[PDB]
Design a protein around this ligand. Sequence first.
Ligand SMILES: CCc1ccc(NC(=O)Cn2c(N)nc3ccccc32)nc1
Length: 319
Amino acid sequence: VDCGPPDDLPSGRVEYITGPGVTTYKAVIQYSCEETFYTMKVNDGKYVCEADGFWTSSKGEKSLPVCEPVCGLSARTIYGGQKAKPGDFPWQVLILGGTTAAGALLYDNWVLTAAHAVYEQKHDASALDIRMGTLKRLSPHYTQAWSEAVFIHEGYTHDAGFDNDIALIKLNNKVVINSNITPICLPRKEAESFMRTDDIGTASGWGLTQRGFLARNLMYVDIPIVDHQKCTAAYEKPPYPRGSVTANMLCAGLESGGKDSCRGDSGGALVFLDSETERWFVGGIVSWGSMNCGEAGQYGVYTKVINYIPWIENIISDF
Ligand SMILES: CCc1ccc(NC(=O)Cn2c(N)nc3ccccc32)nc1
């Protein structure tokens, strides 16, 4: 009974415990991740060669563990905002091609964004130019990524309302997770308790500022979640379609108006602090709002990410 050479672990390594190359029955190997920016999932990495001839873990698993990136780290821990510092938003992704937009890194090979930001480039099969690790929209120094595949929500209808304004981009290569590039966490199920009316989220982006031009450097604002009736009402008026605010949206902004996301922030993550895990998570995706950014009483409208966890998980788990 010889189990053979073990499979390599992405974002991790394998090591022979019993001896270099010892792949015989009861041989022991050890998988490991880079534990600073990755954490091993599934098992402890200890695999023993079994009589059936397959490397097998302390739990009986015959397949590899997973090195999953740490998420939601921030150095803290757009209209009316202030300039982000390096590592404030390590998940921030710039998406260039057709117009300026943004996304948020998930894991080391996915970008969460708004469908409206990528629908047109998707449907004429032009790969997305995805950039990260950079505070400056126009800097020539950045981490390059390219879309391998773009998933637009099957219930999103382009230019016909913003319900289901969510998309996932699979990168053709993993990005290196470090202090400047770190994904955002997905909300845990109870994360709603951090996304109540008057809880504070953070929007970041290079979009229009109060001066009415795109920003050169990444900007951010802290904004409160707005009561959903109040948001629904603010958009029940021409020129907006009937029922523009749905239960798949959360609103955030000021009755006064001087804090908002704008054109060019599309697809950015509206993040919130899980004060118990002490990690940032994505509560919203920058989706739509009034054509006058930062207008009084016209709140930013964000795709409500917690409603899309099955969809997100379905896509990431299957591709
Ligand atoms: C059907 C009527 C109608 C007309 C114009 C608009 N305007 C916007 O949605 C502005 N806006 C964009 N384009 N990205 C944003 C990102 C964040 C906030 C606002 C944003 N909405 C509805």
